[PDB]
Design goal:
Number of domains of chain B: 1
PDB class: hydrolase/protein binding
Distance between the termini of chain B: 40 Å
Number of helices of chain C: 1
Radius of gyration of chain C: 11 Å
Number of helices of chain B: 1
Helix content of chain B: 10-25%
Chain A: Uncharacterized protein
Entry title: Crystal structure of CYLD USP domain (C596A) in complex with Lys63-linked diubiquitin
Largest interface: A-B, 40 and 19 residues
Largest sheet of chain B: 5 strands, mixed
Order of helices and strands of chain C: EEHEEE
Chains: A alpha+beta (about 300), B alpha+beta (about 80), C alpha+beta (about 70)
Shape of chain B: globular
Structural class of chain B: alpha+beta
Oligomer: heterotrimer
Assembly: trimeric
Keywords: ubiquitin protease, HYDROLASE-PROTEIN BINDING complex
Shape of chain C: globular
Structural class of chain C: alpha+beta
Chain lengths: ~300, ~80, ~70
């Protein structure tokens, strides 16, 4: 087992038929990280749903395993998962329709592998609230051109008075985006590490970013503590066959991402997207979800 | 009884509603003022995503409360 | 809705586009990736040459469709 396996064309989750909101998400959470592995392992309780075992089997052994071991997953297997998804919510259109990772994640986590909420948050010192991801919300004008996940998060935590009940193991943040037609910022500096000490009654590390310019999902993954340790994933990077055909996923190294995350925000603001080498453009411009975990890769 | 809904853009929109109303009933009203399918709408109160089945009284929303509105990002 | 554009050489190029977009809007994107004036570009779908005025929805192009590109 290793990394050389994971990289290249015909690697990662092969998408098919509006799958990217799923291929890319699954790739973020599982390809390299292990925050959520427990989910795949908790054995079957009485209390869980009828489908629970099957879901967990497909996920672990037909998806996550062969991802990590061979570096590839046929779309065949994704469609299965989709099917199950629909068995909860008939008229969801998980099998065909374009979806939001939030949608897909909620269904899966809450409804099938009922997973203890990843977050606990106390607004106004009032009752707690649980969820699986936080959406940044705030007011822009008085701010910078390119902020960081840190600032966003902080700023978002303020303006609706909130705080973490307890340290999360795994923190998924959605960028400030009003649909296809509205980014709040052209560029966002994803904080490599995240200090939440101020935001509970210490430290968290960035392990993947999920991107989308307007309508297609692709993913970046931190596989190492190293600056260069980044990969880019596109489930439908290429095709063979006509209308009758099949997609080919690809996974590519992109150290550049690292290099740019050593530059500053005011420095990246000055930069034109057409001058941002390699795949970095999409990370800095098309961030949808940033994903943090309690540190493992980090040294020191 | 009257509450505020804010988009990310900054725009506020006001609604005459009853504590009894459901979040679907509410997105119906939002849609009419802003032409956005409830499919896409994602309402938030106190940092919490609101389910379509529940009512406002249930999320302890009072008159003059402020909700945030956010869209989905369907892709694939 | 992401789609593929193939040159004769074999090279694939991918595009993030909307059904609403026009073929000019698209050749604009192609040009940027491959440095070819839309003057010269000739797009084809289902064996059919695509007019600059029409949109993708109109030619019944779905996501993950494959267009051919050729110079004129």
């Amino acid at each position: 087992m290793g990394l050389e396996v994971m990289v290249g064309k015909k690697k990662g989750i092969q998408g098919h038929y509006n799958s990217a909101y799923l291929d890319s998400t699954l790739f973020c959470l599982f390809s390299f990280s292990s925050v959520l592995d427990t989910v795949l392992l908790r054995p079957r309780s009485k209390t869980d749903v009828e489908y629970y075992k099957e879901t967990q089997e497909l996920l672990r052994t037909e998806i996550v395993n062969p991802l990590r071991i061979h570096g590839y997953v046929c779309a065949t297997k994704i469609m299965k998962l989709r099917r199950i998804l629909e068995k909860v919510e008939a008229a969801s259109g998980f099998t065909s329709e374009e979806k939001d990772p939030e949608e897909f994640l909620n269904i899966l986590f809450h409804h099938i592998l009922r997973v203890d909420p990843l977050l606990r948050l106390r607004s106004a010192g009032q009752k707690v609230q649980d969820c699986y991801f936080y959406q940044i919300f705030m007011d822009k004008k008085d701010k910078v051109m390119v902020p960081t996940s840190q600032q966003l998060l902080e700023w978002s935590f303020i303006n609706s008075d909130l705080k973490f009940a307890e340290a999360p193991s795994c923190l998924i943040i959605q960028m400030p985006r009003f649909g296809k037609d509205f980014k709040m910022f052209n560029k966002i500096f994803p904080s490599l590490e995240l200090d939440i000490t101020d935001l509970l009654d210490q430290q968290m590390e960035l392990f993947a970013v999920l991107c989308i310019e307007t309508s297609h999902y692709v993913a970046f993954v931190k596989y190492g503590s190293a600056d260069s340790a980044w990969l880019f994933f596109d489930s439908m990077a290429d095709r063979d066959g006509g209308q009758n055909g099949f997609n080919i996923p690809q996974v590519s190294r992109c150290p550049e991402v690292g290099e740019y995350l050593k530059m500053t925000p005011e420095e990246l603001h000055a930069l034109d997207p057409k001058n941002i080498q390699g795949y970095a453009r999409r990370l800095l411009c098309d961030a949808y979800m940033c994903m943090y975990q309690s540190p493992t890769m980090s040294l020191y | 009884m009257q509450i505020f809904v804010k988009t990310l853009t900054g725009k506020t929109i006001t609604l005459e509603v009853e504590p009894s109303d459901t979040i679907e009933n509410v997105k119906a009203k939002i849609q009419d003022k802003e032409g956005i399918p409830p499919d896409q709408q994602r309402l938030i109160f106190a940092g919490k995503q609101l389910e379509d089945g529940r009512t406002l009284s249930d999320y302890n929303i009072q008159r003059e409360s402020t909700l945030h509105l956010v869209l989905r990002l369907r892709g694939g």
